[PDB]
Amino acid sequence: RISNCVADYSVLYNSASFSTFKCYGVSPTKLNDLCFTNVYADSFVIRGD
Amino acid sequence: VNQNAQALNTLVKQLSSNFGAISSVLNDILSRLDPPEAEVQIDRLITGR
Amino acid sequence: GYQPYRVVVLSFELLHAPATVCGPKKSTNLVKNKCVNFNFNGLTGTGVL
Amino acid sequence: EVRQIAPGQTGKIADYNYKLPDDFTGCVIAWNSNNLDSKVGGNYNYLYR
């Protein structure tokens, strides 16, 4: 649970490593203006399929 | 007078409903999503109102 | 089909609450009696303050 | 990076190089030209802003 900081959501979108980038929540470029109340970052690794 | 003002009250109160969209604040959806999908979202919300 | 993909999901609990994290957009001082297109952490309305 | 060229995407392949309108009507065509485009010289003559 990341909180009380500033996030570089523009450049995060910029690294071309991201191959499956599905932003069902909101449009990617618009991650910059809105203020997120809180946030979780659930990380793991799964199959390619 | 009671019935007329109560009808108007229901009309105004109807604005809080998401009608199945992402939210009820029309400007929140504008800030969140992109035009090519705000299209369908705003479509649902507008047809509801 | 079986090349392991590292996957991170970023869930945002966007609602009306104390804003903790958002983008590095440059703030500016207020105004009174002059309607403005303000953005107070998602509250993207308009009006005098 | 072909699937990204579509009305409703943003990126190096979607907007930075060449755009598609949100009211476009037409047909995109993509096929595997890895036969001729495979250049022992590394085919670096193919550029993008």
**Residue A44 touches partner C, C-beta closer than 8 Å:** yes
Chains B and C in direct contact, meaning 3 or more beta-carbon pairs closer than 8 angstroms: yes
- Which residues of B are less than 8 Å from A33 in CB distance? 31
Classify burial at B45, counting beta carbons within 10 Å of its beta carbon; exposed 0-12, middle 13-18, buried 19 or more: buried
CA dist A6 → A2, A27, C22, C30 (Å): 10, 19, 6, 22
Residue labelled with tokens 């007078």: B1
Asked if D touches C (at least 3 Cβ pairs < 8 angstroms), the answer reads no
How far from chain centre, in Å, is Cα D48?
10
The DSSP call for residue D31 is: -
Experimental technique used? Answer: cryo-EM
Of C47, A29, C19, nearest in space to D11 by CA: A29
Asked if A36 and C7 touch (Cβ cutoff 8 Å), the reply is: no
Q: A33 and B31 in contact by Cβ < 8 A? A: yes
Q: Which residues of C touch B31 (CB under 8 A)?
A: 39, 42, 44
Resolution limit, Å: 4.2
* Matching residue, tokens 């490593």: A17
Range D8-22 burial, b when 16+ CB lie within 10 A, else e: ebbbebbeeeeebee
Smallest CA–CA distance from B29 into chain A, residue: A26
Is the CB of residue D21 less than 8 Å away from at least one CB of chain B?
no
